[PDB]
Amino acid sequence: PMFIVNTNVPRASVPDGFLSELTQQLAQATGKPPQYIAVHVVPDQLMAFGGSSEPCALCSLHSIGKIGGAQNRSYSKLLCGLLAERLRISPDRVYINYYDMNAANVGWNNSTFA
Amino acid sequence: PMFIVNTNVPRASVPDGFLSELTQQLAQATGKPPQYIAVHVVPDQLMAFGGSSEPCALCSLHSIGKIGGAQNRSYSKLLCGLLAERLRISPDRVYINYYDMNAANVGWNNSTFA
Amino acid sequence: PMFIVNTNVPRASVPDGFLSELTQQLAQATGKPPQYIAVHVVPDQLMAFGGSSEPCALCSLHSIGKIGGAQNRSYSKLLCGLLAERLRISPDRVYINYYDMNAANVGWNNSTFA
Ligand SMILES: COC(=O)C[C@H]1CC(c2ccc(O)cc2)=NO1
Ligand SMILES: COC(=O)C[C@H]1CC(c2ccc(O)cc2)=NO1
Numbered sequence: 001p002m003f004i005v006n007t008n009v010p011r012a013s014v015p016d017g018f019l020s021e022l023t024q025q026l027a028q029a030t031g032k033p034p035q036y037i038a039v040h041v042v043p044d045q046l047m048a049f050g051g052s053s054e055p056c057a058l059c060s061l062h063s064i065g066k067i068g069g070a071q072n073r074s075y076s077k078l079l080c081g082l083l084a085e086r087l088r089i090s091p092d093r094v095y096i097n098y099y100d101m102n103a104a105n106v107g108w109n110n111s112t113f114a
Numbered sequence: 115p116m117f118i119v120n121t122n123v124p125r126a127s128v129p130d131g132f133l134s135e136l137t138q139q140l141a142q143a144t145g146k147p148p149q150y151i152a153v154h155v156v157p158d159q160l161m162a163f164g165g166s167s168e169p170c171a172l173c174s175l176h177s178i179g180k181i182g183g184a185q186n187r188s189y190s191k192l193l194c195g196l197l198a199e200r201l202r203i204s205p206d207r208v209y210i211n212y213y214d215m216n217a218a219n220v221g222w223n224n225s226t227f228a
Numbered sequence: 229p230m231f232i233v234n235t236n237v238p239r240a241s242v243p244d245g246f247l248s249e250l251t252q253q254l255a256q257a258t259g260k261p262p263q264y265i266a267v268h269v270v271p272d273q274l275m276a277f278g279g280s281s282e283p284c285a286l287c288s289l290h291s292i293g294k295i296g297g298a299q300n301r302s303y304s305k306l307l308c309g310l311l312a313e314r315l316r317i318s319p320d321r322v323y324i325n326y327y328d329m330n331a332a333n334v335g336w337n338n339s340t341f342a
């Protein structure tokens with residue numbers, strides 16, 4: 001899986017083990033082995049949510065399977081929880097796009113997962 | 115809705131009220147309340163369009179509904195208009211990907227919109 | 229087509245004709261004229277792949293058509309080859325998301341391709 005977080009929160013406000021925690025938590029949540037998890041955090045971004053400059057996050061989670069109504073709701077609780085606790089971002093200022101990728105559409109190691 | 119603009123235009127060339135203008139214009143265009151609009155501008159990017167380094171923009175608009183043939187054509191006129199006027203980017207050097215998101219695939223405030 | 233590469237590799241490690249090479253190689257691979265190819269490289273990113281901070285890349289290729297099982301496998305060989313040779317990124321630390329865009333969902337020059 002691939003998880004990206006774009007936020008206006010400063011680089012200095014991102015805890016040092018944040019990428020590791022996301023990797024571990026997402027592996028547990030998705031049931032996918034930690035080795036397949038890719039995490040990307042982009043701080044100091046120029047962004048607004050509802051016209052406000054307060055802390056916010058625009059994210060996305062891509063995964064071959066493990067994406068659905070029920071699963072996405074628990075991912076949002078997990079993710080908003082982490083962003084709130086570690087980055088101090090209010091849950092209502094977070095958007096997460098979920099993508100159920102077809103294995104033939106995910107390239108890795110000179111080929112695709114299909 | 116979520117609108118992202120990635121551009122090679124320098125940070126200093128992004129007008130101060132640009133995110134607010136985008137928020138207000140997108141709300142009117144989509145019919146979605148301003149409070150739900152998230153905007154993200156990423157300047158100083160390393161990019162090329164057609165092999166040229168002249169000013170260009172790679173964008174995306176995600177929305178639950180309000181995405182379609184007709185709607186997308188007007189969004190393009192609105193967006194290219196704003197990028198041309200405020201960022202001085204030629205309309206033919208702008209790409210915008212539109213995504214009609216399923217409500218169950220958009221996380222917000224510890225849950226999803228489904 | 230639109231190709232984006234996000235990587236933790238430093239800005240200084242990106243060869244100066246990299247965007248041009250990607251443009252030329254992608255035009256040949258996709259059969260699309262070079263003038264329609266947009267390339268975007270984002271170095272110095274805060275990312276982890278499998279919990280490791282070693283060089284890695286998270287990419288995506290959007291195209292109206294020219295996306296499929298067979299095509300995606302050759303794009304992956306081409307792309308991982310380039311990332312390995314120019315950015316020294318191991319192929320197994322590269323993810324590429326492929327998107328077959330509907331023409332009505334791609335805005336360009338005040339309209340869409342539909
Ligand atoms: C070994 O099979 C897997 O479970 C592979 C993993 C990797 C993956 C994935 C999906 C989408 C991406 O943008 C990146 C990685 N999804 O599942
Ligand atoms: C009243 O509820 C809404 O209309 C909510 C808005 C917010 C939204 C949306 C979709 C996709 C995103 O990446 C971000 C926001 N779509 O609709």
Ligand SMILES: COC(=O)C[C@H]1CC(c2ccc(O)cc2)=NO1
Pocket residue numbers: 209210211229230260261264266290291292293329334341
């Ligand atoms: C002649 O028509 C084309 O080949 C148009 C090109 C442009 C294109 C494309 C798709 C998705 C993008 O985000 C940007 C460009 N795909 O094909």
